[PDB]
Structures are given as C-alpha cells and as structure tokens.
Paper text:
Organisms accordingly deploy silencing factors, such as the E3 ubiquitin ligase silencing factor of the integrated stress response (SIFI), to terminate stress response signalling and ensure cellular homeostasis. After restoration of mitochondrial import, the E3 ligase SIFI marks HRI and its activator DELE1 for proteasomal degradation to terminate eIF2α phosphorylation and restart protein synthesis. SIFI forms an antiparallel dimer of heterotrimers that comprises two copies each of the E3 ligase UBR4, the E3 ligase KCMF1 and calmodulin. UBE2A was captured by the C-terminal region of each UBR4 subunit that became ordered in its presence. Together, these proteins assemble into an approximately 1.3 MDa structure that is built around an open twisted-ring scaffold (292 Å × 229 Å) and two arms that extend to the side and span about 356 Å.
Residue numbers in the entry:
A (entry chain A): 3473 to 3544
B (entry chain B): 3259 to 3337, 3385 to 3544
C (entry chain B): 3758 to 3857, 3866 to 3971
D (entry chain A): 3901 to 4038, 4044 to 4319, 4324 to 4328
E (entry chain E): 287 to 332
F (entry chain F): 287 to 331
G (entry chain C): 5 to 148
Write the structure that this text describes.
Amino acid sequence: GYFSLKTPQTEKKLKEYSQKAVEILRTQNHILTNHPNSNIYNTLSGLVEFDGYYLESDPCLVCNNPEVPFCY
Amino acid sequence: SSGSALQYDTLISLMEHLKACAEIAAQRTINWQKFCIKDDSVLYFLLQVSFLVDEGVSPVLLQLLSCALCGSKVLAALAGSQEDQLCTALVNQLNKFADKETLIQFLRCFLLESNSSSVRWQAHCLTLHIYRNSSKSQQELLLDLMWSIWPELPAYGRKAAQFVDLLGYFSLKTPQTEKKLKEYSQKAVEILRTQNHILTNHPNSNIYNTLSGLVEFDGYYLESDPCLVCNNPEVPFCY
Amino acid sequence: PQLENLLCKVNEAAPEKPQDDSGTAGGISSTSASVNRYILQLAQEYCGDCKNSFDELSKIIQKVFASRKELLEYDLQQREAATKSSRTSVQPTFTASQYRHTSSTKCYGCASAVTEHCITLLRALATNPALRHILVSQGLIRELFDYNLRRGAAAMREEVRQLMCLLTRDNPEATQQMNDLIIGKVSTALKGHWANPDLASSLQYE
Amino acid sequence: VSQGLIRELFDYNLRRGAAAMREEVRQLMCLLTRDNPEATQQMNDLIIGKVSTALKGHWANPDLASSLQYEMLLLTDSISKEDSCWELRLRCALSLFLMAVNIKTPVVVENITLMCLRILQKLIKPPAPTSKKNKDVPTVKPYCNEIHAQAQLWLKRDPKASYDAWKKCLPIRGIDGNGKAPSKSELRHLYLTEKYVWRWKQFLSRRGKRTSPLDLKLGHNNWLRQVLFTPATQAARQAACTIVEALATIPSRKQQVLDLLTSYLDELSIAGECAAEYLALYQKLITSAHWKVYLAARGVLPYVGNLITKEIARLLALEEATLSTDLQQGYALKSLTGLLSSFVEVESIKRHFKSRLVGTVLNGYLCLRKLVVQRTKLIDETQDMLLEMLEDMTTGTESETKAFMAVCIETAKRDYRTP
Amino acid sequence: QNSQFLLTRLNDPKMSETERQSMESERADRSLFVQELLLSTLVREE
Amino acid sequence: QNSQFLLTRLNDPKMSETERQSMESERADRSLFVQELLLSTLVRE
Amino acid sequence: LTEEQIAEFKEAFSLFDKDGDGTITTKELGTVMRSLGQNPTEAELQDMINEVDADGNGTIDFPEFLTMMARKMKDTDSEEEIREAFRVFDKDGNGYISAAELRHVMTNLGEKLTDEEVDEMIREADIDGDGQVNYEEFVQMMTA
Ligand SMILES: [Ca+2]
Ligand SMILES: [Ca+2]
Ligand SMILES: [Zn+2]
C-alpha cells in the first residue's frame, strides 16, 4: 500500500493495481458468501464471541498452527 | 343499605352455615336440588349473596350453585333421569329469576375477576352447565351477554382464559344467524387488531422482542403501572 | 437506558475476540466467558437488576394498594355512619362501590395475554366453515401473517400457524392469498441474502 | 469507484468481520465518496433504497434493528466528514428522518429517526469554533419574516433550491458599523429601501418571474411534536429539544417555535413524564421575562389554567376508579402549575391576570383538596404551589380583593367541607 | 507502539488559521441552511 | 389433565375404511403427479 | 380603527409596560407590536425605536404608541413614502431611478446581486421601455 501511493506511477499501472486489489476482494467476498459453513460462522459471531473457527476442514497450517511463543 | 364490607365474624357464621349446606348438597344432591325447586328464592339469593361476600366465601357459594345447577354426576366426573330433570328445572328457575344484569355481573365477577383459578374453573363449569341445560332462547341470550363482555377483555389479561374457552365453545355450539356470526367474528378480529397495534407501537416493544430473542425471562420487568393482573399471582397456601 | 444501549451493541453482533480479564473473582466457565459480553451484561442488567428493582416496586405497589383499600374502607364506613336518617338500597353495585382486580392499560404483558386469548378464540371459531369464510373475508390471514406469526411464545406461534392453515382450508382464495404473501416475502429475502444475512430469521418461519 | 468498489463494500463487507473491520470498511466507503458527486450520490441512493424497503416492512419485520443499523451508521460516518458533497448526504438524512418519523414504531424511531436526528443536530449545532476566539455560532442572516429555503423542492434535487442558490438569495452579514454614527436619517432611509426592495421581490414573485419565498408560519401539528413526545426513547426527545433550541437562534424564529411549543403544551398532559425534555426546553426558551410577557399577551395563561383545571378534573373523575397507583401521577399537573408560577413570577403579568387567574386557582385548589386516595407527593406539591399562588393573588387593592371575594362566591357556588 | 505500520501512520492532520476561519464560517452557514430547511419542513401546507 | 379446556378437546379424529382407501389412492396419485412434475422440471431445454 | 383594536393595543401595551436602563420601553413596545400580530423587519423596528426619543428610556405613552402605529398600521401601502422611496431609490439627483443607484441601494442593504439580476429588475420595473422608471412605474411595481 505504502509503495503504491508513494511511487509516482502511470495511469495504466495504477488502474492495473486497483483492478488487482478489487479482484482479490471480490474473490474473497464470493468465497466467504458461498462458504459451506458461512451461515454457522456468521450466527456464532453474532451470538457467542469465538477466537477461532473450530469447524474447518484441512485446517490451513497457517491459521491453526501459529508461532509458538518462547517462554521461561 | 349499608356498603363498605361485612364483619369477619358475620362471614364466619355465614361460612359455617354454607359449609353445612355444601356438606348436605355434596353427599346428598337430590335433597338440595328438590329443596331449591321448592324454594327458587334460595337458588337466586345464593348467587346474589355471592356478589356481596369476600373471595374466601365465594368457592363455597359457587360449589352450592354448581351442586344445585349441575348436580354431582358431572361434578364427580369433573373431579337418575329424574335427577337431571331436577337439574333442568333448577336452571330454568334461575333463568326465570336471573335478569341479564345479574347474569352479566357474576359472569364477569367469577369467570373474569376471580383472581383464583379454582373459582374461575368452578364458574366455567357452572356457566357451561347453565348453557347446556338452558333452551334455545336463554342460550342465545347468554352467548350475546358474553360477546358483549368480550370487548372488555383487555382489562383482565390472563385471567380471561377460562372465559374465552366458554365463549368459543358457545359461539360454535349454538346454531346462530349469519348476521350475529359476522358480528362475533368482527368483534374478535377487532380485538385482535387493537392488541396487535398496541404491541407493535408499544414504547418498549423493541426491547421485549429482542430480550425474548436472546435472554430467557418470565415477566416483563420494565413496565409502568404494573398490571394488577400480570404482576399479581394466585399466591398458594403452604405448610 | 443501559438496556437500550446494551441491546444496541448486541444487535451489532461483533465477534469481539474473548477478553481474558485478569480479575477472575466471578466463576465464568470457558463457554460462558466466550458468550458475547453484552449478552451476559444484558442478562445481568435485566434478569438480575431490572427484575430485582421491579420485584421491589411491585411489592411496594401491592402494599400501597392494600393501604389505599383500607383507608377507602375506613372512609366509606365513616361516611356511612355519618349518613344516618338516609339509606340507599344499593344493588348489585355493592361490588362496584367497595370491592373496586384489573390490568393497567398499555401493559405489554397482559396485552400479549389478550392476544393469545384472541388466537385461541379464533382457532375455535375457524372450525365452523361459515365462520372461517367470514374471518377470511375480514382480513384475518394478513393480520396473522404480518403481526402474530413472529411474536409470542413458540406455542403461540405454532397455534397461529395452525390457525392460518385452518383459515386456508378448502378455500382457494384464502390459500392463494397466503401463498402470494409467502412468495413475496421469500423473493424479497432472496434479493438481499448476500447483502444482509437476516434471511434466516423470517424466511425460516415462512 | 469506477471499478464498483462501493457496491461491493456495501453488499458484502459492511456487515461481516470484526467490528474494527466494519468501521474500517465504513471509513473506506466514506473516503471513496469524499469529494466525488458520482460516488457520494450512488452510496446515498443505496442507503435511501435500503432504509425505504425496511420502512415498507417495519410492520412485518421486527429485526429492523440489525438492517437499517449498519446502513445508518454509514450515513452518520459519511456526514461526519466534511467534503464538498455534504448537500446530497444531508438530503438523504432529511428524507430518511421524515419517513421514519411518519412511523411511531419504536424499532423504527430508535434506529432511523434517532440517527437522523443526531445527524441533523450535529449539522445544526457545529463543533465549537477553534479560531476566531471561539466566536458564538451566529455570513448570511435570514429574512426576519421569511424562510428563503425550501424543503419539498430541495429534496426533489431542483437546482432552484440548493445551498448555493439559497446562500446567494440572502444578503451578506457584512459590517453594520455606525459605532459612533447615529445615522438617524440613514436608518429611515435603509428602512424604506429594505421595505420596498422586499416589495419589489414580492411583486416580481406573484407575477411569477422569481422563486416564491416561504412565510414563517407553522401548522402546530408537525413532526416537531412527533419526535417531542416519542415514549420510544429519551435520546430522540433530547435530540429534538436540541434541534429546537438551535432553531431558536433568531428572535422571530423564537416567537414561532414558542407558539409551536405552547401549542404542543396539551401533549405534555397527554404524555405525562415523557415530556420532561420538552418541559426543560420550554422553560429554557422563556427564561427571560420578555418572552413570558409575549406569551402571556398571546393568551398562554388561560390556556395553562384550563389545562390545570382539566387535569385536576381528570384526577377527580379518576379517584372513582380502583386504587391503581401510578408513579407518574401528577407530573403533568405539577409541570403546568410550575409553568403558571413561572409566568406569575413576573409582576406585570400578575397585575393584569390576578382577577382572571383567581377563579381557576381557587377551583383547582379546592378540587385538589378533595383528593384523599389518589393524593400523590406530586399532587401535594401542586396543591402547595396553588396555595402559594392564591396567597400571592389575595394580596392587592381592596377593589381587586373585593373582586377576588366575588370570585370566591362563584367558586363556592360551583359539600360541607370544601367551601 | 502503533508506528510500525506505515499505513496506519499515514493520516496527517493539518489545518490552517485563515482556512480555520473559512471552515468555521462554512459550518455556520451550513447550520443556518439546515435550520431554514427544517423550518420550511415544519411550514403548514396551507 | 388437559380435558378441562373445552376448546383444546375439540379436535376429533375420524376416518373411515373405504374413505381410507380413497384417501390413500389420492396420496399415491398426488405423489405420482409430483414425480412427473419434478421429472418435467429436470427435462432438457 | 375599531375600539376592539385600540383595546388589544392598550392591553398588550400594558402587559409589556416595564422600565429599566438604556431604552427598554422601546424594546418592550417593539415586542408589543410583534405580539399584537404585526411583525416589523429588524430595520422597521430600529426606525420606529429611533422615531421615538421624547424622554429617557425612550418613554412611550399609549397615545404615543397609537400615533406610532397610525403612521404605517399594517404597512399595506404608503404612496407618500413610495414617493419617499423613489426619492431615496433614485440617486444622483435624477428624475428616473437607474440600475446603478438601484444596486447602490442593494449594497447599502447588504445584498449583492449580479449586474444581470440588476438588469432583470430594471426590465421588470420599466413599462414603456425608455430605460428609466418614473414614480409612475415605481408605483407600478409596488402596487401591482
Ligand atoms: Ca437617478
Ligand atoms: Ca420608462
Ligand atoms: Zn397486566
């Protein structure tokens, strides 16, 4: 973001960058809307405060497995 | 001639005598039925007195009226032919004496303002047997009186339950003209519309709807001038 | 105002991540701790605080009513005693004059109770085919659909649904109207399902 | 914006995610519409349509809370910003406000009408100045007798009515000057030129060659009173009170809103304790004896006396019912008596209205003394205030006193205790 | 603290004194316009 | 128990044997109609 | 003027009758007029307040206030002062008001109109089309 607004850039590539950003947004929005258990997560977020999404197939190693904190 | 209320000891003596009569009527019903067919003033006067007594004495007076009015075949079933003939004679005598004003009065007093579900059930049984044992004209007149009380229902809240029961039953049990059928339907739907508009536009309707959605609760705790019906319960006696 | 406010927050339905406050004096189980804080705050404010205050107020109101009744009885006795040489044969107004058991107006509670009584009476009336046609002609189906379908206890809601089904029995015009209402509502909720997920609240009932 | 980001954010990202993410999405939309007629117009129209369909359903849907909610927090965040497209945003706000006020449903009031009232209140009462030594809120001054803005035309996007055109219509405040210059002749001169220039414009408008201004006149049954007694929420009443207090900047508009409020006075008796905010506003607006005397001249004192008499008669006809105890029993009576005492606390009004108020105060006090079972602490305070007012009115010239005695005779004519 | 994120740090408040006076005058004029708008909304339709 | 309330007791089940056969035939025919309806819904345009 | 009206007049005059510093009585009487049912422009109010300076605090008597209102009353029309208007509106010692002095009057009031608006105004006032307005046409407009 910073670089995209810090470098003087041509209109063509500005439009290209904007299109890329909005395309990723549309893809993620459609994924969330049509997600098999989107209704469940929406309702639970409404009623019960939940930190993570416990009902997820193939838990992405990135989400479920976060950096373990070094401690004494 | 004197208003206010009756002395407690007067009610005590009244209750002694009325319990004696109730004991006689329960164990021996025909005796009571024939005594009252010999004395119609007794039957009508017991109701008229049941007006001017406390809710303590009301159960016994209504029990006497039910024993005379609906015998005890049905009373035990709820818990020969000449007996039911006496029952019909007694209800006919009461209908000959009881004007529409006194009928209206006790019907609202015990079915609606009782505040004691037990007295309300006694009045429900009593009025049901009154209507059953009555002929066509008195049946129509009783149905019309209760449909006349129907608009005043919103002032009694939950208490009205038994009342409504009889109304509905009678409204579908008496062969009735199309005009008065339409009138009764219009009254019912008008009360429904009024209550629906009241609930929709109620100042804290949103709050009650949302709380009913989320949190379990029994009474509406945030209510101005708490209803003497919803709030006041039938406190039960306990050992 | 506090309930007014907490309700606003709860309606936002925000997934505020569980806040593990250092203070653990209250015995809050993981599941209860994970419950929306505003929901728990609402439950404490209304079921706890509002209910305690309303119970205190109702007790005071009943005691005040008893005191007023005793004072009125004493005044009635005194004026009756002072009304010597004058006797009115009251009849049967004894009740109206002294007893004076009635629901206050604008009482959501007993108002909803009267609505339930209306539903019971209409379920009784609808049995008679002529009464059923008359009630349909009145406009009962639309009233029940708009207002009584979603409000009241679940037993009352199922009774309202049964009443509508009765009203639409063997009645092509009636069934047609209810079907049109349902279709309209369902299509409107399909015109914003992605936009707003409130579809589950009503479309389910329809 | 040309991509279609606003619609995507509105449909999908407004309601999903953490609350911080939702507020970031709202800020992003506000940024996209910043100084962009196209974008701002599109977002405003979306909000309009959504709120309008939910008002067409309010009666069948009690979940209005979650729907209009997020879209109206977006309006409030959009109008909180200060771009060059404030006009369309204010238009949307006013339209939604009027539509929802036409509705008495609390769900509708507390959501739509409340956020619309807050938007109008933050617009009418701007944040306190930072420079200009925090000058008072009062470049253009309104016409004394006319409203040069139009609402029906402005909402219809008519170029004739707009902030630019309106601001062009009124004269610049400029500088009055003449600090040490009496300019007595110049005063008469400017009087004449102003009068006949306004006449020139008025005649040009009745011929039809110029836009018709509006006359400072109210119907006395408008949304003002609609928000004024909403039992739905105190926030709406407080917002309306602030809006009216800020509308009371100009003395002629003060007169008009004072007439409006003294007309709404009956709704105080109707609504009971819900009118506390309206009462505070009304007493604040007439804190000067100047406007108290103005209202007294218009006939406010007989109106309040009749209202007090009617309330006391309702209480008298109410003690024949059950011993039903009402917490707010006598708030309207106490407030009306407080208003009457506030008016009487001005000497000239007392002089001119002692003979006309003695009868109604006597009748009210006597009828209040009859109360025994329904006597509430507020009723006791009202009776004490009436006693003080009566004692304050007994004092007078023997003529005025004998006249008050003649009233006393009529009051007794209107029971071995009360006389 | 929160200065690690460049994007969040981006917001720059800057507002000048004569432009302060102009903006305050604009706020006052907008408030007056809204007052006239509501007053014309209240005007009886007679 | 629940027999005190006349209105709730009202519901009376009653269904006869030949009318049982007729109603069962009606159910079967309605099921067949819905089957044909869905199959015609699936037909290729 | 019917008594009914002189009566309302005294009535309110009295109700507002109050004394103090500066010229309250003048302010009190301006509020009387507005209370009576006639709202003068701020300019009209200032003019009348000045048009009465007989004694300290602008002392006004009921007869004096009657004299004040008798001059304009409902301010429906005042030929003698439409004339006074033409005298003021027409400047530069001319016999016909011109757009220049018209815009001068507009600025003295504090109104800024584009010359185009001034031209519209003068085209409306002029009837024959000589490019000028006599009392005749001033009247034309003020009366229409
Ligand atoms: Ca000239
Ligand atoms: Ca000419
Ligand atoms: Zn109640």
